[PDB]
Symmetry: C4
């Protein structure tokens, strides 16, 4: 379970690193903005303060969402159930 | 399972083709923008860089969301569990 | 199951009627825009082409989301599994 | 179950209080706007009428989403299944 969580943690980090590199380079965002945009995208918040303006950016974003959402929410779920949940119960 | 995934893959593609055709035609978007908007809508990201401006567009969008979300996330789930998950485990 | 689906269908309609009335009245939207905004909100798309500008609107929106999301996605799920799924299998 | 719901209710309130304080202070929003933005963020609606403009705001928002989504939707689920569901059945 801790190994489950470690792996999803690492995969999430790699997914966000890829988005950070792509959006900084192709869409010209500052790295911090590119990370923030990647997170806002894959958690499906989607403020739209940043969004891809190039066709390369839009196509990547389509594929990035489809491949990354499953991982990100997998990680969030394991975070909530295997980490937050026990500490909450512990505090009781 | 591979047949499960093939079918949801095909249905997702058809759903996105329909949106691409509708939004290009009625909302005047370039086909690539219409595809990108369809994806951004049905994955519930919703940047709002594109959004329907006509009443025909808004009504279609209501019905498109209700009918398409279930399919798109079904596909994402099977992608994550039946495709990404095994290759990840394989890499270990 | 058909009774399950009928009930969630009716409840969803009532939830969207309430939002349509509220946003038309308090936020001044045309009824069609108010319906479209209610749907875009409760499915968590959130384009932001419309959003509440009054404090009454923001407070209602907080409570509307918390109470309506569970119903809307319940309906979407039953739609997908109890309606779309069988017709898809039938087409095969 | 009522104890389950009470706890998630309290935790959700604390999570929203934290966001309200952070966004009022660091992003300069009025408290009501900060609460509304916190809710719009953690339910993944993401209108983008408000969004963090400072780097401190963007970094907090990344961490806030990852930690808060699981709690907020946990609460929504228990609300829907353990509160709305029985009263609906009761009305029948
Ligand atoms: K959004
Ligand atoms: K914008
Ligand atoms: K916009
Ligand atoms: K969303
Ligand atoms: K969204
Ligand atoms: K938006
Ligand atoms: K806007
Ligand atoms: K905006």
């Amino acid at each position: 379970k801790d190994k489950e969580f470690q792996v999803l943690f690492v995969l999430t980090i790699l997914t966000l690193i890829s988005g950070t590199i792509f959006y900084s380079t192709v869409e010209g965002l500052r790295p911090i903005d590119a990370l923030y945009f990647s997170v806002v995208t894959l958690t499906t918040v989607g403020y739209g303060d940043f969004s891809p303006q190039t066709d390369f950016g839009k196509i990547f974003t389509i594929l990035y969402i489809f491949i990354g959402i499953g991982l990100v929410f997998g990680f969030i779920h394991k975070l909530a159930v295997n980490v937050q949940l026990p500490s909450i119960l512990s505090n009781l």
